[PDB]
Amino acid sequence: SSTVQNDLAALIHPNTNLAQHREVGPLVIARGDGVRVFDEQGNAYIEAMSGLWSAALGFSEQRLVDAAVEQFKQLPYYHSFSHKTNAPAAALAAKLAALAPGDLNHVFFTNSGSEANDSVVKMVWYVNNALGRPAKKKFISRQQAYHGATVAAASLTGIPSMHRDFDLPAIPVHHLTCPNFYRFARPGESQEAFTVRLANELERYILAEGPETIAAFIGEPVIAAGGVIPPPTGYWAAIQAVCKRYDILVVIDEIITGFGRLGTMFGSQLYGIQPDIMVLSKQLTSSYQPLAAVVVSDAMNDVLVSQSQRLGAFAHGLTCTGHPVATAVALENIRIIEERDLVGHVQHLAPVFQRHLRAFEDHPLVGNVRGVGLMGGIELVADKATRQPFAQPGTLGGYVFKQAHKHGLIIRAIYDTIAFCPPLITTQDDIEAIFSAFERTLADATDWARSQHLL
Amino acid sequence: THSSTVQNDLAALIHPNTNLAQHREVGPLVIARGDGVRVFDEQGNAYIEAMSGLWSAALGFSEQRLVDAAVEQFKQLPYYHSFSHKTNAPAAALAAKLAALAPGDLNHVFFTNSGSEANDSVVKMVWYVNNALGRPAKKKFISRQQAYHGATVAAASLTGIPSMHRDFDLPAIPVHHLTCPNFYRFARPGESQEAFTVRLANELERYILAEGPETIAAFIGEPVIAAGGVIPPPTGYWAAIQAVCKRYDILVVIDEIITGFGRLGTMFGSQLYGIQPDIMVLSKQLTSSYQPLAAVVVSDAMNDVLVSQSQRLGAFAHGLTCTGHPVATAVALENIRIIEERDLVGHVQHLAPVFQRHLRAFEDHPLVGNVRGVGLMGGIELVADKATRQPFAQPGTLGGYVFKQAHKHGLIIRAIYDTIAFCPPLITTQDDIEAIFSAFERTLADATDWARSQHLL
């Protein structure tokens, strides 16, 4: 059987229209090279999304392969239960502690960001039980947030299509307004005034619920999967100021913004966030190995230790927690990012990247352009004057996603917002190639949107 | 002075399933190198890994063919996702291979990284399918005391081991836990195993009728309870449980994350006990843990409802970044190929009688209350009084000693409170078995002296 035939017979795809899949079948990706991937027939595509916002070092970094191979040949697997450990997992924990801001000094490993955020929920409940605060358990998130796919993590997620028919949220979570200035600012309202309203919304909820029942706020510094939405001016100062006055932990999900994506090593630096807990994945390993990390404070670790003293063990763990090959790849991935000063590279490249995005502001299909560092979004709308969404949201974005392949370009459509998140290794020439292909794609999409009567 | 690894670990690493307070005092044991069924620490001490790590390293700790499979895939495509119709050859081939191996019409496969994610995915799929069918009340899960199904919030709610719930506010989804099917512990005086099975089936049916079958979506269970104490089911259990579930249209979810790929002497434990699952979950031996991978295999009927939902909702809005990871799935494919090529299921069938006899040699030992096991899994439960089956005053005190002391005799086992578990790699030889139990004999002698001096008896 062909790969296509194996796929159509047996594979349930994630985040895919499974009915349309029976008709159109899969696109088989066969090979990676730098910022490009190739399908089974040999067609080339510039991967302007780094896959899933994650392949920081591109798709053929032999030094990551080498790190995996070297570890495989010594010890291809061992666990970290019952005091057992391995050298890469311990070295990576120490490295993440050295990189993370403030007293974020203690690291717990998982396979995925979803597991990591599940672990945060469990750790926070555990610590507040240990502290004699058994009521202090509710989480606060936001509309359009993305924090993962497990039952708890997807309850923190605030994208409504990810809740529909899954009975989510299934744990106590409140979702604030999405901090999207373009979409929700009032006529003539400044970004600062929008932030005032968002911060007051958060505090109004805390006071109505009772702060003694609220354990934590979780958020991405920039909302990615929900639409590439940078925060409005002053937002993170205001949110932290509120949370600090109620002993509400600030959990910062850096699974996409971490490791240079915004032009600083962690997005928390750019926005002046001091997290109580920081969550990392994706560019942590360039997704060459499944790995995520939860980084917590000395104070939180001390409570975890006092719990083991009275309960006998920290009764939480995954079979591959601390996997020696996964953590060895991450350690090498970080070393490359530092040795090659890729954070500095993003700083150098971000202006031309952002300029290319904003060149489309006057385009007939474009309602808003936004972006920070090496992440960007171009939101297409049915009417520029009224910011009107399309009658069936995603109709035009879905076309752009498909049609870009014909021009050798992979982007990701978030309904009708076109996302860009290319590898940290992207060059000036790569940027020009991305936008040449996107120009051709958007010209096709203009003909298509007009014929389809979408505008 | 401590090694750099020890210093790094003590400064920064939060350990899973570890006493974090004791860890500050005793520090970590650094495992450095693998060699077949053995591992070596940083000091050069050697250990026969009688647990395959975490019940999982089926091919042992130095199988170069799995390394080769990872390398060959790394050189072509080190990562790509499976969202938005994208796919890769190893994930598609592995899906087809698992569908070919799985019983009945378990023909459709969803990939995750971990068993916990997989069981979380099962919970979501079951709720999704029941909403799709216009049955919004049919959502409750049934599990069992001492079950283990993972560590995420939902999966750990299905887990029935109380220490894994304590201070975590679990269960946190609707679940009911039946009696643990442990004949040694819960049989009445003179009761046969078949009679105990009847009582367990009637317990399940009474619960269903009292709750309302229209509110109950699924039963989940391991064929043999592993992390909960190596507890095989009593005679006829699975036939009886399945019949009740079928009577009330309750899905049967079989968690083969440990029993899968030959552990019990059949490719899947469902064959040994005559289980036909609606959903089967796989991990661990799937890759010998060389790569994080798990799989959910569902029936045609389940898949048809998932497809009808995408028709009306636009997408199956569920997925992990590394779902279907090409390196992880390529390693799993080669792992299965080696199991088949070397007929390791047949090898387990040959080893199992010898292994089980070595376990039962300890039945008459003064510390041993019960010996149990099937295939290449076994457990030796230590008790304070054999006549009354009395647990120890502080459960785990003796088991913890045995765990520590076995290292001194070159042996790694796992203590489940005071039950000693054995689950060696599929590649274990008869010589290896003799070495395991020679070292365990010496450890149990040490423990008998220690238990006496400690006044535990």
Numbering used by the authors:
A (entry chain A): 5 to 459
B (entry chain B): 3 to 459
Manuscript excerpt for this entry:
In this work, we successfully overexpressed and characterized the two recombinant transaminases TA_2799 and TA_5182 from P. putida KT2440 and solved their crystal structures. The overall structural fold of the TA_5182 and TA_2799 enzymes is similar to that observed for other class III fold type I TAs with two α/β domains. There are two highly flexible loops present in the structures of TA_2799 and TA_5182 that mediate the entry and exit of the cofactor and the substrate/byproduct into the active site of the enzyme, leading to significant conformational changes in the enzyme structure.
The PLP-bound state of TA_2799 is similar to most of the structures found in the PDB, which is the catalytically competent state of the enzyme. The phosphate group of PLP is stabilized by an intricate hydrogen bonding network, either directly or via water molecules, to S118, S285, Y150, and T323ʹ similar to the “phosphate group binding cup (PGBC)” described by Denesyuk et al.. On the other hand, the L322 position in TA_2799 is usually occupied by an aromatic amino acid. In TA_2799, the side chain of L322 is not bulky enough to cause this change, and as a result, the phosphate group of PLP may not be as tightly coordinated when the PLP molecule is bound to the enzyme. C324 is not adequate to cover the crater, so the crater in the crystal structure of TA_2799 is filled with solvent molecules instead.
